[PDB]
Amino acid sequence: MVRSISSGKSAQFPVLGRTQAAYLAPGENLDDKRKDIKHTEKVITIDGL
Amino acid sequence: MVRSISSGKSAQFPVLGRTQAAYLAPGENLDDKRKDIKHTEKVITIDGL
Amino acid sequence: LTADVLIYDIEDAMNHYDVRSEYTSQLGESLAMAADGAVLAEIAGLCNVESKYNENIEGLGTATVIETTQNKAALTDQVALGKEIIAALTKARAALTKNYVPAADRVFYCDPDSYSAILAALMPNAANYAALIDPEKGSIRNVMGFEVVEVPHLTAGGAGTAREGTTGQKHVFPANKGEGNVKVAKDNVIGLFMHRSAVGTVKLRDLALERARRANFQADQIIAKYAMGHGGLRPEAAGAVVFKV
Amino acid sequence: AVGTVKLRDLALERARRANFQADQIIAKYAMGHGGLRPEAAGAVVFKV
Amino acid sequence: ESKYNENIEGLGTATVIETTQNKAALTDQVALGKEIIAALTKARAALTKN
Amino acid sequence: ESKYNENIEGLGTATVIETTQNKAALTDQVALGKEIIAALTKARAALTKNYVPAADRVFYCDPDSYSAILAALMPNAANYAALIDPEKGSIRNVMGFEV
Amino acid sequence: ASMTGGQQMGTNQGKGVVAAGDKLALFLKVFGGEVLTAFARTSVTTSRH
């Protein structure tokens, strides 16, 4: 796979994934327990002509 | 001012200036001497909400 | 069972990629995976970890296949493992036949590595003559009455309580054979073999997606949840091939 | 000399909260204020 | 700022200390105005220079 | 990299190690192909857990080791004919790979 | 023969930044042409249920 950008010197891509489901019952608030989908981004750089 | 950007977090604007106007002798080389142009950027960051 | 994403408004403002669809897909996938793992762990555990009870009387046997030779951790070999998996599979057919149940469909569940062993046992180097498996993009095919799926996520899947794996769980794979009088421990697992009609799944309220807007944080959030119960019935149609110690 | 960079500009939104049997109105913006061309900005102070 | 001027020594920063002035010594209402005016003159000069 | 897999337990790259000893202890060349086949199956396995589409995988070798793979297969000795094709040594695939 | 006064569109100069380590250096690293998701995993059931 190849991609084409114009102008800017470096092209950054973002990567992300995975959750965990949960159990709640009749009378407990949801907001108490939650895990954010941790997302990390990876950067590519142009070397020269 | 009041210039407005969408999407991204922070905006930078570059600055540059001045030249020494040249007196070119006849049948003689300009290519040898250029001052060039001085280049500098300045960036502003936004605080949330 | 719940799925949850809460996205701030300021972070959505300066982000330059929509990320909604990806989050929804992520949620659906999460719920599904939980559902699957819960079932696998259910059949293995609840039918090879219980003591003194086999449903009805003489209705079933609940057999569990031990591995030939010394402890497999000692064999530390690629191929030969394949031999043992083949033998074990023959024996499995022997049990599931010894206790009636139609010849088809049935099935087999191993982990990808053991599947690789099964694949390696029938190769040009060893042994002789053509085989059921095709070399190159090896799909195997069948071992008598089995489909050999080779799923990547065996163990766990019980879900429960906190988002972190450790804590209250509804279905579990114990850590050892000695500890709790259980035999199909987490380390001890090559394959599980069930007929089908050998595990129950009960569905009410199905699964649904809905989003809500919460003014207090300026942030709106998608939620996707569902409710259903998993259980096991008829252990004669269930067994498991297991490491030895 | 100095400029303000604004995103989302300024708007206002009205939401209903049921538990207090009342609604609340809320308006926000999001801006950043930087300072540039510092040579062309001076000030007058007294001190000895 | 501290040395951090901008775009080399080509262009220069500005500041006006008020002359022979202590706020406690001033507050004359008349002297103050005079002083702010003079400071303003030097201010315009400095600004125009760059 | 000493450590580091991006996005913890997103995934973690695998480098299949060789069974047997150093090159000085190999280079018979008939055995190298054996080792490449085994390592290739194990690689298909290492890649298969962790997901990634079954379609479109690709393998990069070099002339030497390719001829070695050509040496593991062949009459003597590799039993039933299988994948490889003589008259040029073009390999169809192995486990879901182009070569 | 190498030519000086190249212009150096990117590079900072400034009054004080000194160092002059690297060049370009200044610019922007921008990409929005592609978002990268975690690999989709399927489910082995229902079917065999």
Curated annotation (Swiss-Prot), chains A, B:
Superkingdom of this protein's organism: Viruses
Cellular compartments annotated: Virion
Parts of the chain that traverse the membrane: none
Similarity remark: Belongs to the T7virus major capsid protein family.
Biological role stated in the UniProt entry: Assembles with the minor capsid protein to form an icosahedral capsid with a T=7 symmetry, about 60 nm in diameter, and consisting of 415 capsid proteins. The major and minor capsid proteins are incorporated into the capsid in about a 90/10 ratio respectively. Once the capsid is formed, encapsidates one single copy of the viral genome.
Quaternary structure, from the entry: Homohexamer. Interacts with the connector protein and the minor capsid protein. Interacts with the capsid assembly scaffolding protein; capsid proteins and scaffolding proteins form building blocks that assemble to form the procapsid, each hexamer of the major capsid protein interacting with 2 scaffolding proteins.
UniProt domain comment: The N-terminus interacts with an internal region of the major capsid protein subunit in an adjacent capsomere (intercapsomeric interactions) to stabilize the capsid.
Name of the protein: Major capsid protein
Species for this entry: Escherichia phage T7
Classification lineage: Viruses, Duplodnaviria, Heunggongvirae, Uroviricota, Caudoviricetes
Shown residues within the full chain: 51 to 99 of 345
